Amino acid sequence: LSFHVIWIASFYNHSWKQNLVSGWLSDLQTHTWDSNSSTIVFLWPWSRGNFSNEEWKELETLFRIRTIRSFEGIRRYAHELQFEYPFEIQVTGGCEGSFLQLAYQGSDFVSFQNNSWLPYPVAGNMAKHFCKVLNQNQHENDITHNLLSDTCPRFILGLLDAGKAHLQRQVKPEAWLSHGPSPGPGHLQLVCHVSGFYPKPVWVMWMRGEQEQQGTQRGDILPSADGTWYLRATLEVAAGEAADLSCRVKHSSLEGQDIVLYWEGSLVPR
Amino acid sequence: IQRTPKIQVYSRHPAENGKSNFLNCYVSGFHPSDIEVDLLKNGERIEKVEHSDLSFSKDWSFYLLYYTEFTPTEKDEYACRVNHVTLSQPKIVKWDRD
Ligand SMILES: CCC/C=C\C/C=C\CCCCCCCc1cccc(O)c1O
């Protein structure tokens, strides 16, 4: 559980850019920046947290001016910083513990530690030169420290409360079986699909009765448009050994009633 | 440092001919963020496909979810077509269903 902001800035040439900004409570997107209207977009009714409209207006004003300042600053010093177009700047900041990190061309470049920007030693002279430009105003850095140490912890706790009915919901998975498309000769690939579950932690194994089949290969947990998760678990078996196999799913929402499906019927085929 | 996209295609529910469902294409681990993703039905582009806001992982690589509501039939084939600077030719990943 951690509140963080994701900032993506693409500088294709001196006269063209694209800025994308979003707020996150771990895997959950809670806010978006509208590049057109230059306003905060609340994705949930509880996204406003325990903060007021006046407090939100000042936060909005601070973000709007710092982005115009950032794009102009990077444009002005791109040559001295040895930034060659097209390039991308990524920033992530928040609290878990507090952090604020910046990448250039998808690699660690600089980070904010305590009250100043520190270069990543590997990023070399460019990153030292960037920190010189970023640390020009100490008052601006003190504002950054206070946002990370004071404003951020106050926001995350006051958000986890307002969104409690959402983050703690239990959504039951559904599962199904299919044939895998790339098996070897004399072998089959059995696939167990698990979808629609929330929260993310899940257990899925191919079984032979009570024996877990350790050839079970679990893929990545993938997102669904509705906020639930998906996972596929595959098992490579010899064609004459797919008998009595089942896929078993355990999830917090099921309260001990595991889902069990059997490699049977037209999948065998009988 | 350029990173090629990983592309995973899946449905929200088991495939049932004539029942409404969601087709997903999760594209991840790529750099730079410029990417073209299309959902295909019988090799033709599906219009008005939705996508998640662009985000990135701890290693700074980007990820997106593309999705669309659809109704599969016995004769239809679906895929995800991705274009990126790291690919000499577009990569087509099929939706596997029994
Ligand atoms: C002149 C060079 C500047 C280069 C990089 C710094 C540019 C932007 C920092 C992005 C970090 C965003 C963290 C918080 C963003 C935010 C989100 C919601 C509300 C806000 O008021 C806000 O500032």
From Swiss-Prot, chain A:
During protein synthesis and maturation, CD1 family members bind endogenous lipids that are replaced by lipid or glycolipid antigens when the proteins are internalized and pass through endosomes, before trafficking back to the cell surface. Residues 1-264 are extracellular. Residues 153-260 form the Ig-like domain. The chain holds residues 25 to 295 of 327 of the full protein. Glycans are attached at residues 13, 36, 50, 114. One of its GO terms (molecular function) is endogenous lipid antigen binding. Antigen-presenting protein that binds self and non-self lipid and glycolipid antigens and presents them to T-cell receptors on natural killer T-cells. A D-galactosylceramide binds at residues 66-70, 140, 144. This is T-cell surface glycoprotein CD1a.
Curated annotation (Swiss-Prot), chain B:
GO terms for biological process: amyloid fibril formation; antigen processing and presentation of endogenous peptide antigen via MHC class I; antigen processing and presentation of exogenous peptide antigen via MHC class II; antigen processing and presentation of exogenous protein antigen via MHC class Ib, TAP-dependent; cellular response to iron ion; cellular response to iron(III) ion; cellular response to nicotine; intracellular iron ion homeostasis. One of its GO terms (cellular component) is extracellular space. GO terms for molecular function: identical protein binding; MHC class II protein complex binding; peptide antigen binding; protein homodimerization activity; structural molecule activity. Residues 5-93 form the Ig-like C1-type domain. Glycation of Ile-1 is observed in long-term hemodialysis patients. Transmembrane segments: none annotated. It is found in: Secreted; Cell surface. Changing residue 59 to P: Increases tendency towards amyloid formation. Changing residue 76 to N: In AMYLD6; reduced stability; in contrast to the wild-type, the mutant aggregates into fibrils with classic amyloid-like properties under physiologic solvent conditions. Glycans are attached at residues 1, 19, 41, 48, 58, 91, 94. Keywords: Amyloid, Amyloidosis, Disease variant, Disulfide bond, Glycation, Glycoprotein, Immunity, Immunoglobulin domain, MHC I, Pyrrolidone carboxylic acid, Secreted, Signal. The modification Pyrrolidone carboxylic acid is found at residue 2. Disulfide bonds join 25-80. Heterodimer of an alpha chain and a beta chain. Beta-2-microglobulin is the beta-chain of major histocompatibility complex class I molecules. Polymers of beta 2-microglobulin can be found in tissues from patients on long-term hemodialysis. B2M alone (not in complex with HLA-I) interacts with M.tuberculosis EsxA (ESAT-6) and an EsxA-EsxB (CFP-10) complex; the tripartite complex can be detected in the host endoplasmic reticulum. The B2M-EsxA complex can be detected in patients with pleural tuberculosis and is stable from pH 4.0 to 8.0 and in the presence of 2M NaCl. It is linked to Immunodeficiency 43: A disorder characterized by marked reduction in serum concentrations of immunoglobulins and albumin, and hypoproteinemia due to hypercatabolism. Patients may suffer from recurrent respiratory tract infections and severe skin disease. Component of the class I major histocompatibility complex (MHC). Involved in the presentation of peptide antigens to the immune system. Exogenously applied M.tuberculosis EsxA or EsxA-EsxB (or EsxA expressed in host) binds B2M and decreases its export to the cell surface (total protein levels do not change), probably leading to defects in class I antigen presentation. Belongs to the beta-2-microglobulin family. This is Beta-2-microglobulin. It comes from Homo sapiens (Human).
